[model samples]
Target chain A: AKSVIHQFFESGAKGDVDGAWACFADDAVWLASEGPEPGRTYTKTEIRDLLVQLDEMARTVRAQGMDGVFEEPVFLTDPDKAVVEWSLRKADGEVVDRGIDLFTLRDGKILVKDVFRKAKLA
Target chain B: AKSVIHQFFESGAKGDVDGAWACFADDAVWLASEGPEPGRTYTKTEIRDLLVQLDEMARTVRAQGMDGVFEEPVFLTDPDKAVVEWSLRKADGEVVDRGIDLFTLRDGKILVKDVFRKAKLAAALEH
Candidate 1:
């Protein structure tokens, strides 16, 4: 599961939509907190939309408009679940989003994704 | 931290407000998503208010009005963090709220409490 998750991220980095979707089950679900759609689900067709979004995110990060890195060695929760911490930077290198993402895997594919973000100071 | 956490819940359940507060540092923060104040942070005076609220909740549950249990052995994330799955039930043994609670402990007291509840589906189906 960990290897498949790693590959999924790498596939996204390479802008391989097919390769990334291939890691997801046919009935897989991806939940995004903020994006083109919030709390939205993606099917096979919408998978391309996801890839496009990822491509844009990557471009933004590369263009120095946005910069972020996934903190890895993704915390291994269990055989089929993992939690990753991410720190996002804005164009000016200011911290933007920092949170933990908890993912559930089914049959080696992502089944659920839940994130805890600090949208405001507590 | 885990031992302290286990003790916090235990002390809270036992209605030992002092014991619970003792575990907390002077500047401790306890954030509750529900109850009197949703995002309100509790201070020392508010700490006793919390005890009253907990007592009320316990009484409600004991009255057979709400049958809920904190499902444990809490999933230990790190030394200072843990997640516990909880299932609430109606007095009639119907499932109510089933979700996860992610807790962050600081200085041996609960500093953060985040709950993801299926409150809509749960309330509809439970009754």
Candidate 2:
């Protein structure tokens, strides 16, 4: 599960949508953290477009804007579940978005991708 | 740190603010997940009133309606940090609220309590 999760995120980092998709089951569900559709759930079929868009944005951000999506740490709760925290940063490295992903795996593929995010409390 | 983290939530479950407070450092910062003052950062001094209010609410709920807050599955990322998830449920066991809390400890005391929660979560659970 951990290796599959690592492959998913690391593949996404390299703008390889197919590589990232390979980590998900055919019937996987995505619970988005932030996007055009925040908090929305997407099926494996629906997630492909979202992945493409995300990879595009990532590539664009890194290539021209010097922005970054920084990942913190990973924690495993159950054998089939893992959690990862991340932050979106501006060119100057100021944090813009902070969130966490709760993943559930089955049969060596991602079955569920649940997202939770933190907001500025001021 | 794990021991302190356990005592913190367990104490909070009992509505014992002072017991939970003992797990935190004097200079703690609490980043709340939800409420009337959502996402707000409270200093240890500021959190005193906040903790008191929550305890009052917890006791009120238990006495009046019997709803409960249940926490589960502590994940320690490192010696200094841990993560926990919790839910607020009615007496019928229907979940009303869900959230995750992240803690950073220092010298056997929690220095930070950062929270993230679902505002109206359910779509994923059903999916």
Candidate 3:
């Protein structure tokens, strides 16, 4: 189960949005910190738009030649949640970005993804 | 450590106010909700005043002829705290009252005690 979560990050690091979305249920919903209605259910088609927005953001960052690296998986029981701690490093070993992905699973796929970007470096 | 916590309740059930206060450090503080300042530091004198108030409340209840029984202990880690589940039972097996005591310990003596009365009869009052 942990490996599956890591796989999502692995795909995202490679900027493979298709692979990333494939790990989600067709009826998956995403809840971002800002913009759009929270806890909004996105259909498969609507999810593609959301994925495109994610990819565009990553592309803008990666265009600076940074390598994305996911830190670790913090799993919580009961409701079955995961907090993905991660960071992005430039070619010069400088940390470009970092954040956490609070996720929920349903039908063995990502059901909700709440992204939180780091406000401070390190 | 758990034994010490159990002892606090044993003393309380016996209506032993002095015994319960004996478990506290001389410099211990207390906090309660509703009536008084939520986080005021009660001096030993002030604490005794508070205990007198508590005893008066308990006596009023116990005067109806019942025995106080502490149910069990639920320990929460990190902050080193406990939630004491308890009840008051009559001589006829009738339950008079039940609630939880949220307590914080320091230096092997009670530093604070917060009492919460039962709103409903169950392990968790949440619905």
Best by DockQ: 2
Check candidate 3 and list the clashing pairs.
Answer: none
- Tens digits of lDDT, candidate 2, B2-57: 36888887888777888887777999999876433435778888887888988888
Instruction: State each candidate's chain A TM-score.
Output: 0.77, 0.81, 0.67
DockQ of each: 0.09, 0.27, 0.03
Q: Write the per-residue lDDT of candidate 1 for residues B1-127, one digit (tens) a residue.
A: 3466667667777778888767665665665433323234676557777877877787777777886577553444465666665566787777654545566777656665554343232111100
Q: Which candidate model has the greater TM-score, 1 or 2?
A: 2
What digit string (tens of lDDT, one per residue) describes model 3 on residues B1-127? 2555677767765667787767776776664422323224465557767776778888887888877777565554323566555667788976565444556677778776655443222221111
Docking class of 3: incorrect
Tens-digit lDDT track of model 1 for A63-117: 8777778766344346576666566777766666555556778887776665444
Runs with alpha carbons beyond 4 Å of true place in candidate 2: A34-40, A56-66, A77-80, A91-93, B34-38, B59-66, B77-79, B121-127
Off by over 4 Å in 1: A34-45, A73-77, A91-93, B1-3, B6-81, B84-127
Model 2 lDDT tens row, A61-120: 678655555464365645577777776666776555567777788988899988787754
Instruction: Provide the TM-score, chain A, model 2.
Output: 0.81
Instruction: State the TM-score of candidate 1 restricted to chain B.
Output: 0.67
Candidate 2 chain A weakest lDDT stretch, 10 residues: A32-41
- Chain B TM-score of candidate 3 stands at 0.67
Name the better of 1 and 3 by TM-score.
Answer: 1
What is the model-wide C-alpha lDDT for candidate 1? 0.61
Query: What's model 3's lDDT at A11?
Result: 78
